[PDB]
């Protein structure tokens, strides 16, 4: 389908563009081309099939909710507003890093990269520990991009997150999708790090945008839909192990996301 063509076009033209943002852009571009609602649901399933991530599904659900003359206007405004979500999250999260603190980061993520790039711009000094993320060697890419900014990065082993947990002042990880109960769907090697951080009273921070809120409520690692895991690729982290949340809507607690979703009504 030309839908996948346009999706790959937006993904390749902009390398740092998120998957959900590109999906919403493609949906709004095809909207110019009732009956419309089924047409859209159909577009969202093909897109979801090509990239199996929670962010794309959340973005599609949010877009359709926005769809329920005026829609083009609201959609352009929404796209322009969500474009600056990275900067909105950075300007609020980069202040929580103090001098002399050691950071423990998970696999590569553009948002944490932007947060650290903004923190180092404020005349600060810290240390970072990136996990290799064995499933796919993206943690090494993160360490490379960090050392490119003149910061003392250090790649650690995927099984050493517990060995260096005592030498970490805080933990800042991304998220593929924020579930209704405040939990997060992140890389498969995230639930084990949060457990250790909680076992050693280490602040476990999470960085995510607003388009990653999804109407899901998994009770354990099994309730997660198999279409998102497929050696699973993602896991669910309980909200009791999360300290705070940094979103474009402002610094939120694990419980505020449920209130936001209830306000939105899916």
């Amino acid at each position: 389908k030309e839908l996948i063509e346009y999706f790959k076009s937006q993904m390749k033209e902009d390398p740092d563009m998120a998957s959900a943002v590109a999906a919403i852009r493609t949906l709004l571009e095809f909207l110019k081309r009732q009956g419309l609602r089924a047409n859209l649901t159909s577009a969202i399933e093909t897109l979801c099939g090509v990239d199996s991530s929670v962010a794309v599904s959340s973005g599609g659900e949010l877009f359709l909710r926005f769809i329920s003359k005026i829609m083009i206007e609201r959609g352009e405004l929404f796209l322009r507003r969500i474009s600056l979500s990275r900067n909105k999250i950075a300007d609020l999260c980069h202040t929580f890093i103090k001098d002399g603190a050691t950071i423990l980061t998970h696999a590569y993520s553009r948002v944490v990269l932007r947060v650290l790039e903004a923190a180092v711009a404020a005349k600060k000094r810290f240390s970072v520990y990136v996990t290799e993320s064995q499933p796919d060697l993206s943690g090494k890419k993160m360490a490379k991009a960090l050392c490119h900014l003149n910061v003392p990065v250090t790649v650690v082993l995927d099984a050493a997150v517990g060995y260096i947990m005592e030498k970490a002042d805080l933990v800042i990880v991304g998220a593929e999708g924020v579930v209704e109960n405040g939990g997060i769907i992140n890389k498969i090697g995230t639930n084990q790090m949060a457990v250790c951080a909680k076992a050693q009273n280490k602040p476990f921070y999470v960085v995510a945008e607003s388009f990653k809120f999804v109407r899901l409520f998994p009770l354990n690692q099994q309730d997660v839909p198999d279409k998102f895991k497929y050696h699973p690729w993602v896991d669910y982290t309980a909200p009791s192990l999360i300290t705070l949340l940094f979103t474009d809507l402002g610094v939120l607690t694990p419980s505020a996301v449920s209130d936001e979703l209830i306000k939105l009504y899916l």
Partner: protein, 318 residues
């Protein structure tokens, strides 16, 4: 208005020198009265000039003493009142002053009523033959305790503070009412925190994430409570609630002269030894059980909504 400037300077000096009134209620009332006077005796055409002037005055008052998290709250409340009024009248540049004054008076009377509003909820959480302990000295907790001592009977234990032993006054005031109170040091908390059934304390400021900046020594009490699984209640009015997080803040505690910790008559060792005297501390939200406010009890996980309701997100930085 040179008299207004003189009053403002006197307030700033007494706040930066040795603080204003001794209790927080009087501090908030005086701050709100000063803000009302500023709004009354001053010239302006648009609400933007008034709100930016109030922002500048509040910034000055906060720079005078950043640890006094009672005046910035009143400034933000007045700013939110002004913004709500402007949005109601425009959603205006000739009669906006009187209505602001009426709103401020409505806020003042409830500010005073907060004490009774809090004390009225004593019988909902206290039962017969209960063992409750407290630390420090707070008027709100004193009223909350002595209001239910007439019909209910319980045991009270007051832990004094090491730098400033202020719990003695509270213990004496409670003993004068016949509650069977006991006095102890702040070093025997965990030793006695095994026969206690509940804990009630008062704070100086409530952060945005449901955390407390109370006197030094309450963090250990909360840790011991969470270890022994004892509900720890915090009785604090709404004006002790600030839209700021634990981190993202420097000068969180207040450091006073080391005279209270180590006297000046020690000798030459004072040149080598480094002494620090923190007045406040930080308590995470995970160790709090309930929040007794003027609008009833509330869990620590529902503080963000009260923040969004009371203050404006753009007025957090001030």
């Amino acid at each position: 208005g040179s008299e207004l400037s003189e009053r403002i300077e006197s307030f700033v000096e007494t706040l930066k020198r040795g603080g204003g009134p001794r209790s927080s209620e009087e501090m908030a009332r005086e701050t709100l009265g000063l803000l009302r006077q500023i709004i009354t005796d001053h010239r302006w055409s648009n609400a933007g000039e008034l709100m930016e002037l109030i922002r500048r005055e509040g910034r000055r008052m906060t720079a005078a003493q950043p640890s006094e998290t009672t005046v910035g709250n009143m400034v933000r409340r007045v700013l939110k009142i002004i913004r709500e009024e402007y949005g109601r009248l425009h959603g205006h540049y000739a009669q906006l002053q009187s209505n602001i004054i009426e709103a401020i008076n409505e806020l003042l009377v409830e500010l005073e009523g907060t004490m009774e509003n809090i004390a009225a909820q004593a019988l909902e959480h206290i039962h017969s033959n209960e063992v409750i302990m407290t630390i420090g000295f707070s008027r709100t907790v004193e009223a909350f305790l002595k209001e239910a001592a007439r019909k209910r009977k319980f045991h009270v234990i007051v832990a004094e503070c090491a730098p400033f032993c202020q719990g003695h006054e509270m213990a004496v005031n409670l003993s004068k009412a016949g509650i069977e109170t006991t006095v102890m040091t702040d070093a025997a908390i965990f030793a006695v925190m095994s026969r206690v059934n509940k804990v009630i304390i008062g704070t100086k400021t409530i952060l945005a994430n449901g955390a407390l900046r109370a006197v030094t020594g309450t963090h250990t009490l909360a840790l011991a409570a969470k270890h022994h699984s004892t509900p720890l209640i915090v009785c604090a009015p709404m004006f002790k609630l600030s839209p700021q997080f634990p981190n993202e803040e420097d000068s969180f505690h207040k450091f006073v002269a080391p005279e209270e910790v180590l006297p000046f008559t020690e000798g030459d060792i004072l040149e080598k030894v480094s002494v620090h005297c923190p007045v406040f501390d930080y308590v995470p939200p995970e160790l709090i059980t309930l929040f007794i406010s003027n609008i009833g009890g509330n869990a620590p996980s529902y503080i963000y909504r009260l923040m969004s309701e009371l203050y404006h997100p753009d007025d957090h930085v001030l």
